[PDB]
Amino acid sequence: ITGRPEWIWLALGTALMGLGTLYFLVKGMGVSDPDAKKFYAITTLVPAIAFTMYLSMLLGYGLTMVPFGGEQNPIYWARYADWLFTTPLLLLDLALLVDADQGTILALVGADGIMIGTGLVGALTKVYSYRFVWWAISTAAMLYILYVLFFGFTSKAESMRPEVASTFKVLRNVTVVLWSAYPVVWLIGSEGAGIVPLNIETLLFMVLDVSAKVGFGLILLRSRAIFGEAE
Amino acid sequence: ITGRPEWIWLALGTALMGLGTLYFLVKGMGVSDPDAKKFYAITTLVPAIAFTMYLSMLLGYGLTMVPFGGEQNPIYWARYADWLFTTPLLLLDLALLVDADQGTILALVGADGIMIGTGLVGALTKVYSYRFVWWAISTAAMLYILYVLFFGFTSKAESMRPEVASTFKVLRNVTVVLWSAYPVVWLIGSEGAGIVPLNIETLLFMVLDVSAKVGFGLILLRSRAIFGEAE
Amino acid sequence: ITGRPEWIWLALGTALMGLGTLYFLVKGMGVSDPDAKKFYAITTLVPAIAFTMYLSMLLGYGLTMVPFGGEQNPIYWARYADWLFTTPLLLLDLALLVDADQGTILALVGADGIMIGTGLVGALTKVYSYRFVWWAISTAAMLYILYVLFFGFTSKAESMRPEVASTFKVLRNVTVVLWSAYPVVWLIGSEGAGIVPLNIETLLFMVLDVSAKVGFGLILLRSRAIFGEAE
Ligand SMILES: CC(C)CCC[C@@H](C)CCC[C@@H](C)CCC[C@@H](C)CCOC[C@@H](CO)OCC[C@H](C)CCC[C@H](C)CCC[C@H](C)CCCC(C)C
Ligand SMILES: CC(C)CCC[C@@H](C)CCC[C@@H](C)CCC[C@@H](C)CCOC[C@@H](CO)OCC[C@H](C)CCC[C@H](C)CCC[C@H](C)CCCC(C)C
Ligand SMILES: CC(C)CCC[C@@H](C)CCC[C@@H](C)CCC[C@@H](C)CCOC[C@@H](CO)OCC[C@H](C)CCC[C@H](C)CCC[C@H](C)CCCC(C)C
Ligand SMILES: *C/C=C(C)/C=C/C=C(C)/C=C/C1=C(C)CCCC1(C)C
Ligand SMILES: *C/C=C(C)/C=C/C=C(C)/C=C/C1=C(C)CCCC1(C)C
Ligand SMILES: *C/C=C(C)/C=C/C=C(C)/C=C/C1=C(C)CCCC1(C)C
Ligand SMILES: CCCCCCCCCCCCCCC
Ligand SMILES: CCCCCCCCCCCCCCC
Ligand SMILES: CCCCCCCCCCCCCCC
Ligand SMILES: CCCCCCCCCCCCCCC
Ligand SMILES: CCCCCCCCCCCCCCC
Ligand SMILES: CCCCCCCCCCCCCCC
Ligand SMILES: CCCCCCCCCCCCCC
Ligand SMILES: CCCCCCCCCCCCCC
Ligand SMILES: CCCCCCCCCCCCC
Ligand SMILES: CCCCCCCCCCCCC
Ligand SMILES: CCCCCCCCCCCCC
Ligand SMILES: CCCCCCCCCCC
Ligand SMILES: CCCCCCCCCCC
Ligand SMILES: CCCCCCCCCCC
Ligand SMILES: CCCCCCCCCC
Ligand SMILES: CCCCCCCCCC
Ligand SMILES: CCCCCCCCCC
Ligand SMILES: CCCCCCCCC
Numbered sequence: 001i002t003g004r005p006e007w008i009w010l011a012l013g014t015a016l017m018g019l020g021t022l023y024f025l026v027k028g029m030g031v032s033d034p035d036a037k038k039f040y041a042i043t044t045l046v047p048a049i050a051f052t053m054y055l056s057m058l059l060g061y062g063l064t065m066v067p068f069g070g071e072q073n074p075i076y077w078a079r080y081a082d083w084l085f086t087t088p089l090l091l092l093d094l095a096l097l098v099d100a101d102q103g104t105i106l107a108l109v110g111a112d113g114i115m116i117g118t119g120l121v122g123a124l125t126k127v128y129s130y131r132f133v134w135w136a137i138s139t140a141a142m143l144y145i146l147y148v149l150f151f152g153f154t155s156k157a158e159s160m161r162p163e164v165a166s167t168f169k170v171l172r173n174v175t176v177v178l179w180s181a182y183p184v185v186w187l188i189g190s191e192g193a194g195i196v197p198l199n200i201e202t203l204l205f206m207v208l209d210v211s212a213k214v215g216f217g218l219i220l221l222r223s224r225a226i227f228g229e230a231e
Numbered sequence: 232i233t234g235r236p237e238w239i240w241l242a243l244g245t246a247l248m249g250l251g252t253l254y255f256l257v258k259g260m261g262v263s264d265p266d267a268k269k270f271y272a273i274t275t276l277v278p279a280i281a282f283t284m285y286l287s288m289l290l291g292y293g294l295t296m297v298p299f300g301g302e303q304n305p306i307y308w309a310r311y312a313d314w315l316f317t318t319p320l321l322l323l324d325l326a327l328l329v330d331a332d333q334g335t336i337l338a339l340v341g342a343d344g345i346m347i348g349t350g351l352v353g354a355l356t357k358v359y360s361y362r363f364v365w366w367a368i369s370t371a372a373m374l375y376i377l378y379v380l381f382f383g384f385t386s387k388a389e390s391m392r393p394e395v396a397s398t399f400k401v402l403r404n405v406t407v408v409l410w411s412a413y414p415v416v417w418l419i420g421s422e423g424a425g426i427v428p429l430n431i432e433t434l435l436f437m438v439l440d441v442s443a444k445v446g447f448g449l450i451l452l453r454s455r456a457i458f459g460e461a462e
Numbered sequence: 463i464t465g466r467p468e469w470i471w472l473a474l475g476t477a478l479m480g481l482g483t484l485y486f487l488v489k490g491m492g493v494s495d496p497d498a499k500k501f502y503a504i505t506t507l508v509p510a511i512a513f514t515m516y517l518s519m520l521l522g523y524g525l526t527m528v529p530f531g532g533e534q535n536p537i538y539w540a541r542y543a544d545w546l547f548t549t550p551l552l553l554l555d556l557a558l559l560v561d562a563d564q565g566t567i568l569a570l571v572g573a574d575g576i577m578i579g580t581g582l583v584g585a586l587t588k589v590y591s592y593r594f595v596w597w598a599i600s601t602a603a604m605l606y607i608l609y610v611l612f613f614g615f616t617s618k619a620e621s622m623r624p625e626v627a628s629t630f631k632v633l634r635n636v637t638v639v640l641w642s643a644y645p646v647v648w649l650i651g652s653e654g655a656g657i658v659p660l661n662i663e664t665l666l667f668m669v670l671d672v673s674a675k676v677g678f679g680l681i682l683l684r685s686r687a688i689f690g691e692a693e
């Protein structure tokens with residue numbers, strides 16, 4: 001484990017995702033509202049999945065070597081197995097908050113799968129220049145997601161209860177800022193141009209992951225928007 | 232790329248799926264009917280997924296070598312990753328058109344997963360004679376799907392609006408004819424008996440894919456069956 | 463095939479899953495109740511999936527070698543591909559029986575995916591002591607599932623029709639007893655401590671699989687709880 005300088009950030013990430021999972025699990029014990037139960041189930045699964053994948057990276061299972069640039073490059077593939085399941089769950093939290101229609105939910109989840117799937121292909125591609133073709137396709141899929149979150153959901157939240165509109169607006173802004181950083185870290189990190197070393201890259205993804213999952217969840221599960229209007 | 236004679240058909244397929252995706256995306260911009268939005272989302276995702284997998288084959292990522300018959304045989308595995316997601320989406324288009332019940336939808340999607348999954352196992356199997364055992368199981372799963380589309384959905388469409396009944400009947404006939412060709416191309420192509428060479432096999436799958444996805448989508452999204460009855 | 467002593471139990475399992483699939487398929491022909499159709503579709507898919515994965519193990523495709531303990535250990539990875547899809551389908555049978563809320567269904571299916579996913583990682587892990595870390599995480603996920611089936615569903619079934627309450631109680635008890643045996647067989651078998659040899663381990667999993675899928679299905683599909691109350 002300790003033979004890799006980035007191990008400290010993988011261990012911290014593992015701990016923070018595990019602690020986040022347990023807090024949400026305990027906090028959700030005393031909840032019977034069927035609407036609130038939906039948000040607790042979605043939001044608790046997110047850091048639980050991330051916990052297992054951070055642990056796999058810490059123990060060395062989620063790491064492979066990819067030859068490109070005449071070098072064997074360490075690629076943590078477990079990140080994409082994490083994101084494949086956690087990013088659509090996070091979008092479902094937002095879509096259920098605004099009572100989005102089914103067709104829009106399917107478009108979001110499908111574009112998200114394309115985003116993560118093409119990012120994985122780009123991470124494992126051995127022809128250096130082709131890695132950035134996949135990065136560009138994946139980034140186009142992300143821009144579609146961000147467009148929908150702004151010019152489809154925002155207008156839908158305003159016609160909703162005030163507390164669900166204000167909570168959505170906050171979580172929307174958090175998501176757009178944090179998610180946009182991921183393609184940048186990829187491009188300048190060891191998967192892309194190799195400007196930033198792997199140990200610093202790992203620290204950046206850990207800050208982003210914890211903020212986008214545990215920070216996101218703390219804002220959502222403390223809001224009254226997750227409960228139905230009741231007397 | 233150009234070192235493979237089949238590259239021209241992979242490049243054409245990539246272009247036609249990309250163009251198809253963009254047309255459906257633009258055409259769906261001016262749509263607010265929640266029913267129509269469902270069909271546009273399903274139908275636009277189909278060629279978008281196929282685009283990415285054709286590109287992976289063009290660039291050489293979606294290709295592996297499988298030893299059988301005393302030879303290293305080029306097997307494009309990316310086809311099955313495509314079909315795993317696009318064939319159930321196409322069946323969902325048909326099932327939603329006739330307002331099929333949930334139990335029937337699950338049976339269709341499950342049989343479809345078995346069809347594609349066993350076809351993938353057959354494509355990667357190293358014992359030559361066993362490849363055709365998997366082909367037979369996969370073909371049995373397809374025949375179940377075709378039976379349901381005829382002796383379960385057809386009777387359901389007649390009790391529906393006339394425009395949804397006539398549109399379903401057309402898309403049903405297109406699907407049964409085109410899908411039935413796939414097991415035949417597999418059997419006589421490089422995955423099976425090896426009668427037809429890979430470059431011709433690739434041309435045939437490209438014609439079938441574009442017809443079953445973009446041609447299918449053009450018929451559906453030009454129909455009024457996708458809109459609810461409104462004044 | 464016959465070069466492996468466990469082949470006899472893989473062949474028996476294949477036959478019993480295939481026969482089970484055909485019986486459920488025939489029995490479900492004469493069913494039009496939309497509620498009953500749901501249970502028949504879920505319950506017939508379970509042994510059909512298991513059939514294909516037992517066949518892959520029989521023919522040698524679903525087997526790999528994992529080095530640990532200074533030895534190349536035969537690991538049947540196809541079991542986890544089976545369980546990944548069949549265990550959530552079995553939980554869906556139970557959840558639909560008691561009309562569970564959506565949030566609870568998602569929590570069950572998500573915990574089940576974590577259970578199977580971490581068990582697969584543990585089966586393929588090359589550092590011997592780490593294999594049991596994954597076993598423990600997977601077992602914690604199972605205990606969560608069992609808790610929900612007892613202290614969330616049981617109370618919900620009592621407020622239901624008497625026949626659905628008594629049928630659920632029976633299937634609940636069958637599930638908790640049979641599922642609990644799996645982590646024990648893993649721990650003492652070739653994936654874990656290696657006390658029980660592989661051929662005996664394979665026999666035990668076959669008895670458990672057939673009971674948990676075909677036996678489970680025979681109890682459910684003979685009950686009147688799967689039909690709506692009708693005159
Ligand atoms: C509606 C939305 C959900 C739609 C989703 C969008 C999606 C279509 C976007 C594209 C996804 C696609 C790129 C997934 C590729 C997975 C692949 C990286 C797995 C590893 O295989 C890659 C190479 C080794 O580098 O295999 C070496 C050769 C091996 C012999 C490969 C044989 C196994 C194949 C991988 C079998 C295909 C399985 C499916 C891809 C499983 C789904 C994986 C997940 C990442 C989507
Ligand atoms: C309700 C419906 C959706 C049900 C679906 C029906 C489905 C059950 C039908 C059978 C599907 C099954 C054959 C999928 C097999 C995937 C497999 C080809 C992936 C590549 O692995 C094959 C060998 C190399 O040749 O791995 C070499 C050895 C490696 C060490 C393998 C270890 C990884 C395992 C593959 C882990 C299992 C992952 C799941 C199979 C992922 C789903 C893939 C998709 C193709 C279903
Ligand atoms: C809501 C719920 C459904 C959530 C589900 C819970 C889930 C997150 C729990 C953890 C699942 C995770 C451990 C799955 C790992 C699959 C992995 C074993 C496949 C084989 O790859 C392992 C190594 C060889 O030993 O690959 C060698 C290196 C290769 C180069 C690997 C590159 C391919 C990657 C495997 C791509 C990721 C694909 C996804 C993991 C596909 C889903 C598989 C299924 C088992 C979940
Ligand atoms: C909890 C994890 C989250 C919210 C991860 C989000 C990840 C992304 C938005 C990743 C995007 C990428 C691109 C847009 C292209 C480059 C490759 C990716 C996958 C890093
Ligand atoms: C857009 C792609 C489509 C509609 C693909 C359809 C593919 C099939 C219907 C494939 C069927 C197969 C068999 C029936 C057995 C032989 C292997 C397959 C997977 C080619
Ligand atoms: C039809 C198959 C069924 C119902 C299989 C159930 C399997 C389990 C409940 C497996 C559980 C495991 C653990 C709890 C940890 C050890 C590894 C597993 C996956 C065997
Ligand atoms: C979206 C965030 C990207 C900003 C990356 C900042 C990295 C600064 C760290 C110093 C770079 C290390 C280079 C010298 C080793
Ligand atoms: C009462 C609110 C705080 C509860 C404690 C939460 C502990 C989980 C770890 C959170 C750290 C990361 C927060 C986002 C920066
Ligand atoms: C379902 C369509 C299958 C028909 C295949 C027709 C192939 C004819 C092309 C000529 C065969 C090439 C053999 C000589 C190289
Ligand atoms: C107005 C209808 C035609 C629009 C142009 C569609 C261009 C997408 C490519 C379609 C070619 C394949 C059609 C099926 C044979
Ligand atoms: C949950 C069931 C686990 C019980 C396992 C009993 C196995 C007894 C078979 C004899 C053990 C073989 C050891 C000598 C070869
Ligand atoms: C009339 C009920 C029996 C029908 C025959 C079922 C045959 C399928 C194989 C069942 C054997 C396994 C039963 C569970 C132990
Ligand atoms: C194995 C991959 C299957 C999933 C394909 C994605 C489409 C799923 C459609 C689900 C239809 C709704 C069923 C109720
Ligand atoms: C990782 C594979 C999980 C999918 C298994 C297929 C069954 C899914 C059941 C979904 C139940 C409906 C939830 C609302
Ligand atoms: C185009 C939709 C408007 C909202 C999206 C904001 C774009 C942020 C740019 C992200 C940069 C990634 C490289
Ligand atoms: C048996 C259901 C009737 C409709 C299915 C038509 C069968 C077409 C044969 C396809 C040939 C594939 C080898
Ligand atoms: C803790 C929830 C109560 C019901 C679960 C029964 C636990 C059975 C123990 C299984 C042993 C697996 C190692
Ligand atoms: C080795 C660098 C080659 C540059 C390729 C950049 C491709 C980016 C595509 C974005 C449209
Ligand atoms: C090398 C050819 C061996 C023939 C096997 C055919 C199997 C087909 C099974 C269809 C029932
Ligand atoms: C080689 C045996 C090492 C023992 C590790 C046991 C780990 C079990 C963790 C359960 C909390
Ligand atoms: C609940 C605390 C979980 C912390 C265990 C993971 C941290 C790795 C320490 C080496
Ligand atoms: C929108 C046009 C997309 C065409 C790019 C793919 C074709 C491959 C050319 C080499
Ligand atoms: C319907 C009977 C299915 C039996 C075939 C599988 C058994 C393997 C025999 C070698
Ligand atoms: C993106 C930063 C999240 C901050 C988490 C703190 C929330 C406390 C209510």
Ligand SMILES: CCCCCCCCC
Pocket residue numbers: 405442443445446447449450453
């Ligand atoms: C299967 C052939 C499809 C033909 C596509 C043309 C549709 C234009 C309306």
Ligand SMILES: CCCCCCCCC
Pocket residue numbers: 636673674676677678680681684
């Ligand atoms: C767990 C044992 C199941 C027994 C199956 C027999 C059911 C006949 C109704």
Ligand SMILES: CCCCCCCC
Pocket residue numbers: 169170173174177
């Ligand atoms: C009005 C809410 C502002 C939230 C933005 C937070 C950016 C990290």
Ligand SMILES: CCCCCCCC
Pocket residue numbers: 176177180181184
């Ligand atoms: C909408 C604000 C985008 C912020 C992008 C930050 C990328 C590091």
Ligand SMILES: CCCCCCCC
Pocket residue numbers: 400401404405408
């Ligand atoms: C009555 C519609 C006929 C459609 C069949 C088209 C076959 C390619």
Ligand SMILES: CCCCCCCC
Pocket residue numbers: 407408411412415
């Ligand atoms: C229902 C007509 C089937 C046509 C099969 C064509 C196979 C090449």
Ligand SMILES: CCCCCCCC
Pocket residue numbers: 481484485488489
């Ligand atoms: C295995 C075939 C079953 C025969 C019919 C059983 C009575 C519905």
Ligand SMILES: CCCCCCCC
Pocket residue numbers: 631632635636639
């Ligand atoms: C009251 C029903 C008892 C069922 C338990 C069966 C254990 C195999």
Ligand SMILES: CCCCCCCC
Pocket residue numbers: 638639642643646
């Ligand atoms: C609730 C009874 C548990 C039985 C466990 C059996 C494990 C072999």
